[PDB]
Design an enzyme around this catalytic site. Structure first.
Site, short mmCIF file in Angstrom:
data_model
loop_
_atom_site.label_atom_id
_atom_site.label_comp_id
_atom_site.label_asym_id
_atom_site.label_seq_id
_atom_site.Cartn_x
_atom_site.Cartn_y
_atom_site.Cartn_z
N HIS A 40 48.34 -16.19 -6.57
CA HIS A 40 49.04 -15.64 -7.71
C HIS A 40 50.52 -15.41 -7.42
O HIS A 40 51.28 -15.14 -8.35
CB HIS A 40 48.32 -14.42 -8.30
N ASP A 84 41.99 -16.40 -4.52
CA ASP A 84 43.41 -16.06 -4.57
C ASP A 84 44.04 -16.25 -3.19
O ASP A 84 44.28 -15.30 -2.44
CB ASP A 84 43.60 -14.64 -5.10
N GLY A 175 54.05 -5.91 -5.42
CA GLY A 175 55.03 -6.30 -4.43
C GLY A 175 54.47 -6.43 -3.02
O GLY A 175 55.11 -7.05 -2.17
N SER A 177 51.46 -7.90 -2.78
CA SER A 177 50.62 -9.06 -3.00
C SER A 177 50.97 -10.18 -2.05
O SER A 177 52.13 -10.47 -1.79
CB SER A 177 50.77 -9.57 -4.42
N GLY A 178 49.91 -10.84 -1.56
CA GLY A 178 50.05 -11.93 -0.62
C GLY A 178 50.09 -11.51 0.83
O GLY A 178 49.93 -12.38 1.70
#
Ligand SMILES: [Ca+2]
Length: 223
Positions: A40, A84, A175, A177-178
């Protein structure tokens, strides 16, 4: 990260910042030329920033390297966030040392109750917004699948796990994320989603990396 602590400069040496003019997602360095992040977080024009602590100040340990290729998982579903995960190849190899280093992929999946380290430059508030300049850290346990499914009925697939605190107050956030979830020195999760941040009975949801090791290894071997 809500309810965490300041990690300290370069204490999380595999943490990267994805930059498209600004920080927008985290990631993890898994070898000198490849980063893993969340699907995402996909966009074109990614610069990978290694060796960062303060993302607004050049402190002397940074390496800034453009992406040459991004590969979103074949079965990523943006509506459910199943699968994801995304790989990013760097245009040139990073220079590895104590402050910039890869994180190992797992050989087995981690069990509920295992303590992990989650890190990022995301929002530090559950109400309102405050984005830190320096890297934040949070220690949190993996929750049982039954607790996770109870918290998010109908939404948890076999490719997800929950981690955090059902009482609220401590979580990853926008923020982050990942970015990485590291347990016993292995990358076990990717910051993926949750309902709000740090809310009671709404823990963070993470991509279950151990389900993807074959795909990661095959993809890196051929690209
Ligand atoms: Ca910096």
């Amino acid at each position: 990260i809500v309810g965490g602590y300041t990690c300290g400069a370069n204490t999380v040496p595999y943490q990267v910042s994805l930059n498209s003019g600004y920080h927008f997602c985290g990631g993890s360095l898994i070898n000198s030329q490849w980063v893993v992040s969340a699907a995402h977080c996909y966009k074109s024009g990614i610069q990978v920033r290694l060796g960062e602590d303060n993302i607004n100040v050049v402190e002397g340990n940074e390496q800034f390297i453009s992406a040459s290729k991004s590969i979103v998982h074949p079965s990523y579903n943006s509506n459910t966030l199943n699968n994801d995960i995304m790989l990013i190849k760097l245009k040139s190899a990073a220079s590895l040392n104590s402050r910039v280093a890869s994180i190992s992929l797992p050989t087995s999946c981690a069990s509920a109750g295992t303590q992990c380290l989650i890190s990022g430059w995301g929002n530090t508030k559950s109400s309102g917004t405050s984005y830190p300049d320096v890297l934040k850290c949070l220690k949190a346990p993996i929750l049982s699948d039954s607790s996770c499914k109870s918290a998010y009925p109908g939404q948890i697939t076999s490719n997800m796990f929950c981690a955090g605190y059902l009482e609220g107050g401590k979580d990853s956030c926008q923020g982050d994320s990942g970015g990485p979830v590291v347990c016993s020195g292995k990358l076990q999760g990717i910051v993926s989603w949750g309902s709000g941040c740090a809310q009671k009975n709404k823990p963070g949801v993470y991509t279950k990396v151990c389900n993807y090791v074959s795909w990661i290894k095959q993809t890196i071997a051929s690209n």
